[PDB]
Amino acid sequence: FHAEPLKEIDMDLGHSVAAQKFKEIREVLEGNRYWARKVTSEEPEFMAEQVKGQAPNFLWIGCADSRVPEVTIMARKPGDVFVQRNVANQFKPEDDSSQALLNYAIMNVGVTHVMVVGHTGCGGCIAAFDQPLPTPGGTPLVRYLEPIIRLKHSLPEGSDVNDLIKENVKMAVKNVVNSPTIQGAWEQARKGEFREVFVHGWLYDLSTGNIVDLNVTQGPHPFVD
Amino acid sequence: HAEPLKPSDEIDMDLGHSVAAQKFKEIREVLEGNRYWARKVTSEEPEFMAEQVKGQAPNFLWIGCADSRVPEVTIMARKPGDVFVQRNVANQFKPEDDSSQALLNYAIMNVGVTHVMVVGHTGCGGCIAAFDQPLPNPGGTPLVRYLEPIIRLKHSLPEGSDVNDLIKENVKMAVKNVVNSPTIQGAWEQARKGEFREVFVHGWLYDLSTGNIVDLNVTQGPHPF
Ligand SMILES: [Zn+2]
Ligand SMILES: [Zn+2]
Incomplete structure (x- = not known):
């Protein structure tokens, strides 16, 4: 909202x-x-x-990694992009933090596009990649990384780090889509009571500087072209 | 040709x-x-x-708000690779969250950062939302549940306190929380034993009226002075 000048x-x-x-x-x-x-x-x-x-059109759900600043790499300005950044771009459905952030973006500041953005060289994924499934969980990290570890174990044999990174984006996208916020927005939008909102999954490729769409976009309707 | x-x-x-x-x-x-x-x-x-x-080898960790008007790299004229970032609603660092604690620890131990800046900003909707609230009947939407500590903070401030007063104190609270972290404590005790680099925590306030970052001068390191 409205900034009061300082003091x-x-x-x-x-x-x-x-x-x-x-x-x-x-x-x-x-x-x-x-x-x-x-x-x-x-x-x-x-x-x-x-x-x-503020009236950003985008919410960026991205990684803490210092190499992936959203405004620079999307060549945007302040005010364009509402942002969550945590380690390995997770959106955990149990997390009040994340649900509050997502609901505020959509219902309070008017976001239309939500992008989960992973990136190559992601240390969270690289670290999750060679762990065992929990029984319980060593550090705060290994525990935090639990869903990505589980995910690694559902990958086809011979899958590499970049496949994990990619599927981790798609998993976050699903978690977002299954939030009360988005399920509620879509129910309204279908009936023309609210704007349509879309959730996207993207991957930032450190070797090129390019954002690649993983094409897992969903909105209130079947999203085909 | x-x-x-x-x-x-x-x-x-x-x-x-x-x-x-x-x-x-x-x-x-x-x-x-x-x-x-x-x-x-x-x-x-x-x-x-x-x-x-x-x-990556950033010297900074930025703990900031999701607000779209506060992208760290832009407003500090930095490049990618300079700042490791946590962004959530109203720049909280809850001492009991594995996500924040893992991020902080990963930044210091794995990534090598030396400075941790908690950055708040004027016009903070997280703070403006918690300014209006009565106290925990234990939290009526997950935003209210997430803004508890700030809601608490708000009620402890003297009468006539404004939003900007709460925003400033929220930064200082967050700074206090990082300092009290196991990560910082264990870097500082290790550093005083001349075994780890010194790491420092700062509290900043980004003033949307002018575009200037205000240092609140609450910096802490392993030693005074
Ligand atoms: Zn990463
Ligand atoms: Zn804010």
């Missing part, structure tokens, strides 16, 4: 303790100062429009 | 694989933007793709 809060980056002690911190904050000056002057109305609220 | 196909033709052909790009101009637009981006990067930076294929 001890101190804007001069000369007064940031960390920026005084760490070059890398100063660099990033100075990067931000320069970004803001630049944008303020090439689109004086940008900051003003964004203070009013 | 034979000329390559022009980029726009190659891109149209490349996107033929995507059913949805054939159905939604919005989707085609984002996949075209991506392809133009990837072409450019590959041309200006012939070995970007090569290095990112090999692995």
